[PDB]
Amino acid sequence: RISWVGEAVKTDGKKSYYKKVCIDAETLEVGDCVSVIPDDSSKPLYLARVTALWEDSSNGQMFHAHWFCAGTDTVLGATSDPLELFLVDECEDMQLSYIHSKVKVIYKAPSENWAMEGGMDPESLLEGDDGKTYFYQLWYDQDYARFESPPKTQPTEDNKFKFCVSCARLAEMRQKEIPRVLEQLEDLDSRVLYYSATKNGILYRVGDGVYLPPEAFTFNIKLSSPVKRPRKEPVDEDLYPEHYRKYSDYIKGSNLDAPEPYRIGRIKEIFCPKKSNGRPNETDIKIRVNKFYRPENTHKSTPASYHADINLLYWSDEEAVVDFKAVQGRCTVEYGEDLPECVQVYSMGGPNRFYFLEAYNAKSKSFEDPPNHARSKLPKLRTLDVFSGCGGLSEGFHQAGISDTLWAIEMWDPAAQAFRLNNPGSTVFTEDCNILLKLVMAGETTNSRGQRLPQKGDVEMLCGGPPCQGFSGMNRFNSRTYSKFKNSLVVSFLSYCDYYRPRFFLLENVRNFVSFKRSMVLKLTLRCLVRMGYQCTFGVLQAGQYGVAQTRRRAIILAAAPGEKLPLFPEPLHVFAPRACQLSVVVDDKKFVSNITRLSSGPFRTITVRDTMSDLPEVRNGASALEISYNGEPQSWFQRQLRGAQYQPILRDHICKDMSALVAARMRHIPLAPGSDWRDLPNIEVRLSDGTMARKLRYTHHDRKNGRSSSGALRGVCSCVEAGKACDPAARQFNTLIPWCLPHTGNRHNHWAGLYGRLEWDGFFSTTVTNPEPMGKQGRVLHPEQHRVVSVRECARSQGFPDTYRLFGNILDKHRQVGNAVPPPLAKAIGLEIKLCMLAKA
DNA sequence: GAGGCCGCCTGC
DNA sequence: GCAGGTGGCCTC
Ligand SMILES: CCc1c(C#N)c(SCc2ccc(CNC(=O)CN)cc2)nc(N2CCCN(C)CC2)c1C#N
Ligand SMILES: CCc1c(C#N)c(SCc2ccc(CNC(=O)CN)cc2)nc(N2CCCN(C)CC2)c1C#N
Ligand SMILES: CCc1c(C#N)c(SCc2ccc(CNC(=O)CN)cc2)nc(N2CCCN(C)CC2)c1C#N
Ligand SMILES: [Zn+2]
Ligand SMILES: [Zn+2]
Numbered sequence: 001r002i003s004w005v006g007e008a009v010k011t012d013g014k015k016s017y018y019k020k021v022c023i024d025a026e027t028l029e030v031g032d033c034v035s036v037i038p039d040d041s042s043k044p045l046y047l048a049r050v051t052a053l054w055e056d057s058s059n060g061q062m063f064h065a066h067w068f069c070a071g072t073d074t075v076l077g078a079t080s081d082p083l084e085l086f087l088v089d090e091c092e093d094m095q096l097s098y099i100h101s102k103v104k105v106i107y108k109a110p111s112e113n114w115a116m117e118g119g120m121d122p123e124s125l126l127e128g129d130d131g132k133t134y135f136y137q138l139w140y141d142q143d144y145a146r147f148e149s150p151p152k153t154q155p156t157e158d159n160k161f162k163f164c165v166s167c168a169r170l171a172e173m174r175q176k177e178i179p180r181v182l183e184q185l186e187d188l189d190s191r192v193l194y195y196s197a198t199k200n201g202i203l204y205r206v207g208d209g210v211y212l213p214p215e216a217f218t219f220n221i222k223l224s225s226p227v228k229r230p231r232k233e234p235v236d237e238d239l240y241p242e243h244y245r246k247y248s249d250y251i252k253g254s255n256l257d258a259p260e261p262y263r264i265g266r267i268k269e270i271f272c273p274k275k276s277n278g279r280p281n282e283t284d285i286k287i288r289v290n291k292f293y294r295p296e297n298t299h300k301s302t303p304a305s306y307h308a309d310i311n312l313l314y315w316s317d318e319e320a321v322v323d324f325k326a327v328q329g330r331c332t333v334e335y336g337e338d339l340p341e342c343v344q345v346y347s348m349g350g351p352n353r354f355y356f357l358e359a360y361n362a363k364s365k366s367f368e369d370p371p372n373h374a375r376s377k378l379p380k381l382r383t384l385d386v387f388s389g390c391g392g393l394s395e396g397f398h399q400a401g402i403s404d405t406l407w408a409i410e411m412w413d414p415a416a417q418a419f420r421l422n423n424p425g426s427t428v429f430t431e432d433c434n435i436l437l438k439l440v441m442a443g444e445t446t447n448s449r450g451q452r453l454p455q456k457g458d459v460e461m462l463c464g465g466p467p468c469q470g471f472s473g474m475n476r477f478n479s480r481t482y483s484k485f486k487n488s489l490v491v492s493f494l495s496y497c498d499y500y501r502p503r504f505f506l507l508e509n510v511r512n513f514v515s516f517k518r519s520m521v522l523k524l525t526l527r528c529l530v531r532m533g534y535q536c537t538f539g540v541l542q543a544g545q546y547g548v549a550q551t552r553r554r555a556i557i558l559a560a561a562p563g564e565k566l567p568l569f570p571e572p573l574h575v576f577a578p579r580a581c582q583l584s585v586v587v588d589d590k591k592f593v594s595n596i597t598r599l600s601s602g603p604f605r606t607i608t609v610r611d612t613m614s615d616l617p618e619v620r621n622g623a624s625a626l627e628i629s630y631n632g633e634p635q636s637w638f639q640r641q642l643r644g645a646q647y648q649p650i651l652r653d654h655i656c657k658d659m660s661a662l663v664a665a666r667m668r669h670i671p672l673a674p675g676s677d678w679r680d681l682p683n684i685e686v687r688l689s690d691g692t693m694a695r696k697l698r699y700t701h702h703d704r705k706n707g708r709s710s711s712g713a714l715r716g717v718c719s720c721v722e723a724g725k726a727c728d729p730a731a732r733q734f735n736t737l738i739p740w741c742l743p744h745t746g747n748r749h750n751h752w753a754g755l756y757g758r759l760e761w762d763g764f765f766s767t768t769v770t771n772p773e774p775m776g777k778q779g780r781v782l783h784p785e786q787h788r789v790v791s792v793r794e795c796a797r798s799q800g801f802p803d804t805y806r807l808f809g810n811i812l813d814k815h816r817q818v819g820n821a822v823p824p825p826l827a828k829a830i831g832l833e834i835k836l837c838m839l840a841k842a
Numbered sequence: 843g844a845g846g847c848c849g850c851c852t853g854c
Numbered sequence: 855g856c857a858g859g860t861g862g863c864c865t866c
Contacts, residue, residue: 248856248857250856250857252857472860473851473860474851474852475851510859510860511859512859512860515852579857582853657844659844659845660844660845662845663844663845734846739846739847740846740847741846741847741848742847744847744848745847745848748848748849749848749849750855750856750857750858752848753856753857767859771861773844773845774845775845775846775847776845776861777848777859777860777861778861
């Protein structure tokens with residue numbers, strides 16, 4: 001009792017398409033939505049749109065089902081509106097007998113007045129439902145967790161009766177994934193030359209720059225097998241009784257495992273080998289490139305990288321043939337003297353830009369002029385920055401050219417004053433953001449200081465980082481902690497988003513924002529954005545990959561209004577230690593990644609502690625002079641950038657905490673070799689600067705787990721080294737050069753690795769802290785050579801702040817301002833992705 | 843106000 | 855077990 005209605009629309013092969021069918025008491029036509037029975041009766045019904053109806057000579061009565069995704073199957077899980085569906089590129093042929101019923105599915109489109117329709121209370125944002133039939137508003141990418149406006153793919157007259165948009169988009173994706181050759185230049189003896197080729201939607205022509213993996217080719221300058229570090233030569237165990245705790249071969253902050261950046265070539269030929277009959281084998285695409293040298297690839301090796309621009313290359317006449325499938329992306333490489341602009345303007349004007357001024361001759365180990373054949377606005381968004389701090393995120397967005405931060409909210413006054421000092425045109429509110437929003441919603445125009453409150457339409461971009469105090473555990477919500485979340489600053493920030501409805505929205509936070517409360521904080525944040533009707537996504541970024549010598553992972557939530565394009569996450573710019581670049585996120589057993597494809601290498605070398613601060617003058621422990629001489633010119637590219645173009649005769653805030661006499665003696669005895677920390681301290685008496693004496697540490701109890709030194713000395717410093725015995729107060733020792741508490745509890749704290757630890761010139765900072773303390777958790781705060789902790793200026797350099805960026809207050813206030821900020825280079829990379837969306841808006 | 847002192851959880 | 859990820863609070 002399955003009956004076709006009418007004559008066949010088209011007969012193709014063993015298929016006869018129809019526009020309408022009758023099943024029992026119902027009639028179905030293309031475009032109708034149906035439910036479909038699953039094998040597991042416990043599982044819910046599948047829902048689909050019918051995109052075609054045909055009789056098959058071998059399969060019987062058939063239709064094409066374009067499946068909807070239930071909201072509960074997305075990252076939103078159980079927080080989803082129970083009747084919300086999402087478009088996905090999932091579809092298949094199916095027998096008509098599997099249809100259970102016809103269902104109503106409504107497209108809930110945002111209205112033309114969407115930007116004025118905000119103001120629902122937090123309960124409505126978090127838990128409110130549409131309360132109607134099935135509906136969709138957004139398309140969903142299940143691997144990247146992206147909610148976007150539905151695609152506008154269009155059918156022709158050759159497919160209108162059977163058009164499946166999912167089939168069409170999948171076919172486009174497949175074609176985009178396959179390398180192809182387009183033009184045709186010449187036919188040689190054993191190969192065919194081509195003028196252009198395409199890969200992953202990128203067009204490559206003869207003469208373009210290509211990124212290649214570091215293994216793609218070698219240079220004529222082969223290598224120098226370095227004198228490797230020996231196997232930890234023995235030390236005097238009586239002099240250094242805690243050195244045994246360094247049995248791990250892992251050094252915090254070391255760049256020994258960072259990969260090489262990309263090889264860079266200029267396409268000389270694009271070609272295919274010929275078949276036996278003369279035709280080209282276009283499944284086998286090759287390119288011949290000229291090799292570019294980075295400075296560190298010449299005979300001068302790594303030190304050549306110290307002073308050179310990070311995008312400086314050297315031309316050479318060496319050539320390599322590589323598979324086209326190895327290309328990692330396209331880049332622009334230009335001879336510097338032929339630019340219509342200076343090198344700095346060129347380098348700041350776009351991505352993937354390199355330049356060369358000379359050619360390198362490997363045979364002669366010399367430099368030459370390149371050969372002739374090597375030659376050949378947008379209005380800013382009015383931005384509100386909530387929980388701005390001193391303004392690192394706003395500074396990076398400003399550098400990207402996308403925003404003017406006209407309003408900022410910062411409750412901690414020294415940070416608010418710093419933000420004002422750097423942004424004279426902005427209005428900085430110090431009130432509770434809840435109070436400010438309530439005033440705006442009540443129709444107030446100015447706050448109690450006479451500052452004008454932003455109104456609907458004023459705010460075009462909203463960014464901030466809300467604290468998660470009270471719900472930053474990993475365990476599941478309960479009634480109390482869920483109430484704390486509902487009344488929290490995260491939800492207040494979401495309320496700002498709902499009321500103002502900016503074009504773009506950014507929430508930044510610590511990495512574990514994606515995992516707090518079994519990922520429910522993340523899921524609810526996304527749920528609120530979708531409930532407002534925003535496009536949105538999330539991901540994790542590593543700041544070191546965008547140009548700071550610092551490991552700092554951040555969770556990022558991005559949203560874009562209906563009518564906008566949802567931004568992509570920025571591709572890594574700098575290679576960085578892979579152990580610090582774990583960006584994936586597991587939510588309810590589903591592993592999510594961002595759109596980022598640079599997982600193994602990148603265009604630029606890693607930024608080091610040397611890059612960051614080798615130019616700063618020597619200062620002492622407790623340095624307090626607020627304005628001093630730099631004592632020399634900037635040395636590295638990074639320093640040239642951060643000092644800026646205008647000559648700065650005064651270096652500011654190169655001041656350090658005044659550590660006590662005992663702490664200073666300890667710092668003076670930490671060796672300079674990489675990986676040095678408290679475990680390298682000698683066990684000696686030392687006279688302190690205040691006349692007092694630092695004492696030897698005595699070993700008073702036998703530590704069965706840790707054994708004894710080679711002279712038979714014990715290794716415990718307290719009775720608690722026994723199984724169940726408590727701590728003996730008489731066993732506590734004071735004013736020892738080796739701190740008593742570190743051997744006291746080291747066995748359960750990974751030997752307190754990194755406390756009193758030195759940075760290394762070749763390595764990177766641990767996450768820049770708000771108050772550098774050698775015996776705190778983030779204790780690796782000692783200068784690579786000087787006997788002091790890092791200065792405020794050095795922390796600001798680790799964050800990528802320009803040297804001209806003003807700070808405010810006492811030294812601890814300035815450290816906290818620096819340590820709480822988003823690094824401007826990270827903020828700038830994100831902002832450039834938003835700029836791409838602004839320019840591409842349809 | 844410094845600096846001594848040092849829990850709990852998770853991914854691998 | 856190893857390494858990372860969240861700082862506060864005595865005591866004076
Ligand atoms: C978010 C990923 C996802 C999405 C997305 N996106 C979808 S789309 C809905 C849909 C897609 C395809 C079919 C065809 N049948 C098969 O694929 C099995 N051979 C039916 C329904 N469904 C999902 N569920 C429910 C459908 C059936 N299971 C695969 C269980 C997983 C899941 C999941 N986790
Ligand atoms: C037991 C702790 C808890 C937890 C935990 N753990 C959670 S998880 C968040 C969540 C879970 C399920 C849904 C589905 N409900 C819908 O309505 C869908 N639109 C939405 C959100 N939520 C909670 N409350 C409270 C009232 C019930 N409401 C759901 C609001 C949220 C509570 C609580 N007390
Ligand atoms: C390794 C250093 C360390 C550290 C370090 N670092 C920490 S941090 C603890 C912490 C405090 C506040 C927040 C903020 N709270 C929210 O945000 C609300 N959700 C988070 C974590 N605790 C430590 N113990 C445990 C707590 C304090 N004593 C009981 C003993 C010492 C220790 C130690 N030894
Ligand atoms: Zn299809
Ligand atoms: Zn003890």
